[PDB]
Amino acid sequence: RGWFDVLDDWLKRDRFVFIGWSGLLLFPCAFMALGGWLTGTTFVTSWYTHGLASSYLEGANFLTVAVSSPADAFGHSLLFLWGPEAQGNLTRWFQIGGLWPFVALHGAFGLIGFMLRQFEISRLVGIRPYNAIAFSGPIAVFVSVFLMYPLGQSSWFFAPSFGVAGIFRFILFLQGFHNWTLNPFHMMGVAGILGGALLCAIHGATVENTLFEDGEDSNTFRAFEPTQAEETYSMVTANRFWSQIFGIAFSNKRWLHFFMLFVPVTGLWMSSVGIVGLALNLRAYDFVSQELRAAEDPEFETFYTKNILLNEGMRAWMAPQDQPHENFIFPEEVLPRGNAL
Using CB under 8 A as the binding rule, the residues of this chain from 107 to 166 that contact other proteins are 117-118, 121-122, 124-131, 133-134, 137, 161, 163, 165-166
CA dist list (Å): 253 to 173, 250, 256, 257? 42, 7, 5, 6
User: Would you count residue 89 as binding ligand BCR (CB under 6 A)?
Assistant: no
Q: Residues marked as binding? A: 106, 118, 131, 186, 203, 250, 257
User: Would you count residue 337 as binding Cl ion (CB under 5 A)?
Assistant: no
324 vs 98: CA distance, rounded Å: 18
191 vs 324: CA distance, rounded Å: 36
Among residues 35 and 75, whose Cβ is nearest to ligand BCR? 35
User: Would you count residue 38 as binding ligand BCR (CB under 6 A)?
Assistant: yes
Q: Can you say how many angstroms the Cα of residue 315 is from the centroid of all Cα atoms in its chain?
A: 24
Choose the stretch contacting ligand BCR; rule: CB under 6 A; options: 30-38, 162-170, 241-249, 319-327: 30-38
105 vs 112: CA distance, rounded Å: 11
Least CB distance from residue 175 to other proteins, whole Å?
Answer: 7
User: Would you count residue 219 as binding other proteins (CB under 8 A)?
Assistant: yes
Choose the stretch contacting other proteins; rule: CB under 8 A; options: 79-87, 102-110, 145-153, 269-277: 79-87
User: Would you count residue 287 as binding other proteins (CB under 8 A)?
Assistant: yes
Least CB distance from residue 323 to Cl ion, whole Å?
Answer: 25
User: Would you count residue 194 as binding other proteins (CB under 8 A)?
Assistant: yes
Among residues 63 and 282, whose Cβ is nearest to other proteins? 63
193 vs 213: CA distance, rounded Å: 34
Residue 46 DSSP symbol: B
79 vs 92: CA distance, rounded Å: 11
Spatial contact of 70 and 155, defined as CB atoms under 8 Å apart: yes
Least CB distance from residue 302 to Cl ion, whole Å?
Answer: 11
Least CB distance from residue 128 to other proteins, whole Å?
Answer: 4
Angle between helices 20-43 and 3-11 (to 10 degrees): 50
Among residues 38 and 310, whose Cβ is nearest to Cl ion? 310
User: Would you count residue 36 as binding ligand BCR (CB under 6 A)?
Assistant: yes
Number of shown-chain residues binding ligand BCR (CB under 6 A) = 6
User: Would you count residue 47 as binding other proteins (CB under 8 A)?
Assistant: yes
156 vs 86: CA distance, rounded Å: 16
**Between residue 174 and residue 193, which ones bind other proteins under the rule CB under 8 A?**
175-176, 181-182, 187, 192-193
User: Would you count residue 88 as binding ligand BCR (CB under 6 A)?
Assistant: no
Total residues found in the chain within this entry: 341
171 vs 332: CA distance, rounded Å: 25
With CB under 5 A as the contact rule, the residue among 82, 306, 328, 330 that binds Cl ion is 306
User: Would you count residue 201 as binding ligand BCR (CB under 6 A)?
Assistant: no
Question: Side chain identity at 230, as an amino acid letter?
Answer: E
Contacts of 99 (CB under 8 A, 6+ apart): 36, 37, 39, 40, 44, 67, 93
Among residues 90 and 171, whose Cβ is nearest to ligand BCR? 90
- CB atoms closer than 10 angstroms to residue 84: 8
User: Would you count residue 39 as binding ligand BCR (CB under 6 A)?
Assistant: yes
181 vs 117: CA distance, rounded Å: 35
Identify what 49 binds: Cl ion, other proteins, ligand BCR, none; CB under 5 to 8 Å per kind.
Answer: other proteins
